[PDB]
Structure 1
Amino acid sequence: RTHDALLDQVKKLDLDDHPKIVKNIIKAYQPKKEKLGKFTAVLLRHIIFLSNQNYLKNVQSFKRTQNALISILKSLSEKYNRELSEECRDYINEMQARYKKNHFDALSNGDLVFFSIIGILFSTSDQYHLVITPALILMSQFLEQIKFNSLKRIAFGAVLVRIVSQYQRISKRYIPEVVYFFQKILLTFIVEPLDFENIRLDSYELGLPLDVDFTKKRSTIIPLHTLSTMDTEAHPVDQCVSVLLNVMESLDATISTVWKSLPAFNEIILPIQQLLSAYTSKYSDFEKPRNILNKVEKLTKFTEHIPLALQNHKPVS
């Protein structure tokens, strides 16, 4: 309770399966200010640590207790926000200390799940926030400055794209960085080239050959990041097409939520349009890309595509 390490040791000694139960009992005893703020600090640190350490238990024995912990966090966040924001700021500062010390060697699926829970909990629709907007630009920097050269980084980008898709389905904003991420991922997947050299990718080793069945039984998004990101070094074409379809589905969801309202979706998608046309000319059996092209063509037909009226203001009296 008083110390994060001490309370983590107590929870581990009691049980990893019912650390949520032990912490809930302790918090109920305590609520019955500073004590509960320290409990919130230790609970956030402990759930991040658990996400970093272990996910071997299945949905029926680990996801249930994780969701119980999430509910306890919802209760303590509905009861307290100031201490939670302060520890969020500290957690930031330590993230960027880690990142400046090691650009890629000091990140965590714990940071990713922290971002996800922050987005789920807070009123993400706010234009400016002491927590959301800082973490928003931190997430942008995370997805942009990472030297994309491996499938674990690709999956990190994919989960970041999913969380910002939630962000801009509840907020409806636009990210040129996620556009660049999509273009870079497509180019590094189909590098195997002559039509795209301004994207400046990093890795010349991974591609996409014509040995995929792309069926429904073929591995879907099914994101087990706490396992996929650490077993992704073994690289089958099934895993490659699964992550490709994951990023493509997130791209389509972002389109259908915000980018239809985006006025320049046509010129946003033009590089993606060329990449997907190359996809179709190379494979000729990609139904989801076909539907994406149909949707973009529909948007081009329905958009005004007319010169704007930016400098049209009313006269002064």
Structure 2
Amino acid sequence: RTHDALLDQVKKLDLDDHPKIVKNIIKAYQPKKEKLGKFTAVLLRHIIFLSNQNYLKNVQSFKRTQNALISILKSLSEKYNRELSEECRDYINEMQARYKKNHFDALSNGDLVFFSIIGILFSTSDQYHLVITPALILMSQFLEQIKFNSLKRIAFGAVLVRIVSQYQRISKRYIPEVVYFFQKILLTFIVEPLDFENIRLDSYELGLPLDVDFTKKRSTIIPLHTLSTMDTEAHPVDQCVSVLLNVMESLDATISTVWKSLPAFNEIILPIQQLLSAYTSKYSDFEKPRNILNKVEKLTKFTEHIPLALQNHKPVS
């Protein structure tokens, strides 16, 4: 509890599936300020470390102890916010130093799960925050500055898109970078071209050919990121169509929460519109693209599409 490595060694000398209970007992003893602050420190860093190391255990032996650790984190976060925000800031600093030393080679699924637990835990609907908005622009720079050339980076972007979809289903804001991410991933999926050279994708090796059944028993989102992003170098067409429908479902979710309220959804969606019309003219059996075009056609028929009243204010007395 006094040191990160020390308490990690304690938990590991115990048992990682029972380290939750051991740390809970230790925390209960300590609770029965500085001790629990250092415990929050080691518990954050230790669950991020565990998410970096191992996910071989299943939902009935790993997700349950991870959610128990998450509940302990909920308790210590309802009790403490200053030390948690402070080490959150130090985590911003260390992951930014990691990025500037290695643009891609110093990131983590632990940082992804750190972002998701911040999004679940904090008042994400706040406009300005000492933790959220730094983490918000970190997630932006993370999804944008990565040279998208491989499916593990595509899945990194997918889970970032899911987290900001939660962010903007509770906060309802807009990201030009998630628009750019959607267009870039669609173009690198259908690069296999003549209609989009402004998107500036990175890699000319992966595509989407015409040998998919796209059934329901065909792979859904089912995001086991700590395993799927580590085995996605083996590339079947089914993993590609699952991550394609994953980013498509998060795309449709972001639409249905915020982009219907976005006033320029028409001109936001036009490059995506030409991309999806190319999808339908290329494959001619895509029902979720068909539903998306139907929803956006309803939105074009429903929106005002009228010149605005921006420079209209009341006369001064």
Bin for the TM-score computed over the shorter chain: over 0.9
**Inter-partner Cα distance in structure 2 for 1:96 and 1:16:** 29
Deviation at 1:88, TM superposition (A): 0.1
Residue by residue over 1:133-183, the C-alpha shift from the partner in whole angstroms, topping out at 9 and shown as x without a partner, is 000000000000000000000000000000000000000000000000000
3-state SS of the aligned residue for 2:24? helix
3-state SS of the aligned residue for 2:125? coil
Deviation at 1:251, TM superposition (A): 0.1
3-state SS of the aligned residue for 1:28? helix
Deviation at 1:312, TM superposition (A): 0.2
**Inter-partner Cα distance in structure 2 for 1:242 and 1:210:** 15
Structure-2 residue corresponding to 1:162: 162
Deviation at 1:18, TM superposition (A): 0.6
Number of positions where the alignment pairs a residue of Structure 1 with one of Structure 2 = 317
TM-score by length of 1: 1.00
Structure-2 residue corresponding to 1:209: 209
Deviation at 1:69, TM superposition (A): 0.1
Deviation at 1:264, TM superposition (A): 0.1
Residue by residue over 1:51-95, the C-alpha shift from the partner in whole angstroms, topping out at 9 and shown as x without a partner, is 000000000000000000000000000000000000000001000
Residue by residue over 1:16-58, the C-alpha shift from the partner in whole angstroms, topping out at 9 and shown as x without a partner, is 1111000000000000000000000000000000000000000
Structure-2 residue corresponding to 1:106: 106
Deviation at 1:207, TM superposition (A): 0.1
Deviation at 1:267, TM superposition (A): 0.2
3-state SS of the aligned residue for 1:86? helix
3-state SS of the aligned residue for 1:184? helix
**Inter-partner Cα distance in structure 2 for 1:37 and 1:303:** 51
**Inter-partner Cα distance in structure 2 for 1:32 and 1:206:** 57
**Inter-partner Cα distance in structure 1 for 2:96 and 2:84:** 19
Residue by residue over 1:219-256, the C-alpha shift from the partner in whole angstroms, topping out at 9 and shown as x without a partner, is 00000000000000000000000000000000000000
Structure-2 residue corresponding to 1:29: 29
Structure-2 residue corresponding to 1:289: 289
3-state SS of the aligned residue for 2:221? coil
Residue by residue over 1:259-289, the C-alpha shift from the partner in whole angstroms, topping out at 9 and shown as x without a partner, is 0000000000000000000000000000000
**Inter-partner Cα distance in structure 1 for 2:96 and 2:222:** 30
Deviation at 1:114, TM superposition (A): 0.1
**Inter-partner Cα distance in structure 2 for 1:304 and 1:115:** 37
Residue by residue over 1:297-316, the C-alpha shift from the partner in whole angstroms, topping out at 9 and shown as x without a partner, is 00000000000000000000
Deviation at 1:194, TM superposition (A): 0.2
Deviation at 1:196, TM superposition (A): 0.1
Q: Aligned-residue CA RMSD in angstroms?
A: 0.2
**Inter-partner Cα distance in structure 2 for 1:160 and 1:43:** 23
Structure-2 residue corresponding to 1:5: 5
3-state SS of the aligned residue for 2:316? coil
TM-score by length of 2: 1.00
3-state SS of the aligned residue for 1:74? helix
3-state SS of the aligned residue for 2:129? coil
